[PDB]
Amino acid sequence: AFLHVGAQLGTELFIVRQLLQIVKQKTNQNSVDTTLKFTLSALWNLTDESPTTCRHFIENQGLELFMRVLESFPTESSIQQKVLGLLNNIAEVQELHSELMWKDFIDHISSLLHSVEVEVSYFAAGIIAHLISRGEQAWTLSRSQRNSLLDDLHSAILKWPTPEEMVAYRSFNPFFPLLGCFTTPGVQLWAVWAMQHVCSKNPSRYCSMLIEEGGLQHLYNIKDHEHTDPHVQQIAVAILDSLE
Amino acid sequence: AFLHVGAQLGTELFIVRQLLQIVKQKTNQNSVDTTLKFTLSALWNLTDESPTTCRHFIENQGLELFMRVLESFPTESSIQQKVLGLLNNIAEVQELHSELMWKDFIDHISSLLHSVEVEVSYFAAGIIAHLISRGEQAWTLSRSQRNSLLDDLHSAILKWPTPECEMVAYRSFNPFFPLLGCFTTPGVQLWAVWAMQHVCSKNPSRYCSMLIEEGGLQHLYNIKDHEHTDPHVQQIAVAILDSLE
């Protein structure tokens, strides 16, 4: 039995709010312990593929909280990894785009994009890639930082070493729009790089998911677009032969 | 995205643990408040249709804490309802039957069967019915208490008024089906039929098609024609029936 019809959504939003309260406590106590880490995990997991949870996170000031956990633990890469990963889930949500065009937010993650901890930088790139993908007038912040950041995104991915599981997906669908941003080649480079990674270390799961969800057509579409960035085109042909 | 493949149940259980911590901090503060009531609803729904969460609850000192919650809030009817509804979910899981063979627990439940609030005693009766439905042999506690509790379960169901709103939700009637066959234990069949009639009449659009799809018509018809059956269980059975037939 349960409380009433529909009570499940109410208690998921309640759980989100209590987890955020724990995060706030821990940050206040400067206490990097196992339950803070598990709270960041649980939050990150609940935002997975749930626009509703991501909306709630925002509405309970979670973005300001996570800016503060980033400022209070600048040496804890596992922590920033969970923080930015959840924020990557949020940047995946189109109606939430305006919420992230905060100056201190974008500044902090443009800082973290240049970490050499790929575990950390991958999700900062995710955030920036999704954001820039929304187009020009959608960008309500400094036009010059948009133009800077897309180049830096491209450059920082190129420096990535091949990691030793950074991330897991149930679907590639949030990637496919990125794959078509020829105007902005770092967005694609992040997408194809992410795909190459997850396909390369758990192919049984991920190559299948990719094919079933119609990825081949998109990759291959980059292929015959004769005027694409050569870094992107190279990664995409690697991914294609992986299947083909 | 998420952390690694198949990493969701570690977080579910971490959540049950943290909700229990909230319960014990609110209890020590003697602080009936909206956070505590939300926390008890969250625990209730999480145990819904999942013997793993029930097990993790009992594993993390869940039911001693719920005992103390009952004891610290003797008049709070909504608290008691949420406590007892979780405990009813736990009473449905057969592997976990042994861990509810506890005098203090059974005493708490038998008392709350006589609440003047049917929202409370309904779940007390659910716990009692699932518990005594499992045969005399699985009752590691007293048999005198068992007999007296069947007599009281039956008598109390008949004192119940029609509730105002729907008191509870169910995704499935399957837990009830085994109780309807317990012809030897009329109170258990009585609770099961009363609960079906209640949800069916409060919310027929939801529960009538559900009850017909999961094969309830047959358990009900079996009650209808079985030669020796309790009158009241039979009355409620054919009422449920002719509200379709």
Residue numbers in the entry:
A (entry chain A): 479 to 642, 644 to 723
B (entry chain B): 479 to 723
Task: Give the exact sentences the study uses for this entry.
ZER1 and ZYG11B, the substrate receptors of the Cullin 2-RING E3 ubiquitin ligase (CRL2), recognize N-terminal (Nt) glycine degrons and participate in the Nt-myristoylation quality control through the Gly/N-degron pathway. Here we show that ZER1 and ZYG11B can also recognize small Nt-residues other than glycine. Furthermore, we present the crystal structures of ZER1 and ZYG11B bound to various small Nt-residues and uncover the molecular mechanism of non-acetylated substrate recognition by ZER1 and ZYG11B. In conclusion, we propose that ZER1/ZYG11B not only targets Gly/N-degrons for proteasomal degradation, but it also has the ability to bind a defined selection of non-Ac/N-degrons by a conserved molecular mechanism of substrate recognition and target their degradation through the non-Ac/N-degron pathway.
To understand the molecular basis of ZER1/ZYG11B-mediated binding of non-Gly Nt-residue peptides, we determined the crystal structures of ZER1 bound to either SFLH-, AFLH- or TFLH-peptide, as well as the crystal structures of ZYG11B bound to either SFLH-, AFLH- or CFLH- peptide. Meanwhile, ZYG11B displayed appreciable binding to Nt-Ser (KD of 6.8), -Ala (KD of 7.1), or -Cys (KD of 3.0), albeit slightly weaker than Nt-Gly (KD of 2.5). Structural comparisons indicated that the peptide-binding modes of ZER1 and ZYG11B are similar. The free α-amino group of the Nt-residue forms hydrogen bonds with the side chains of Asp556 and Asn597 in ZER1 (the counterparts of Asp 526 and Asn 567 in ZYG11B), respectively. Furthermore, the carbonyl oxygen of the Nt-residue is stabilized by two hydrogen bonds from Asn597 and Trp552 in ZER1 (Asp 567 and Trp522 in ZYG11B). The main-chain amide and carbonyl of the second residue (F2) on the peptide hydrogen bond to the main-chain respective carbonyl and amide of Asn679 in ZER1 (Ala647 in ZYG11B). The main-chain amide of the third residue on the peptide is anchored by a hydrogen bond with Asn553 in ZER1 (Asn523 in ZYG11B). Likewise, consistent with the structural observations, the mutants W522A, D526A, N567A, E570A and N523A in ZYG11B were defective in binding to the XFLHVGQD (X = Ser, Ala or Cys) peptides.
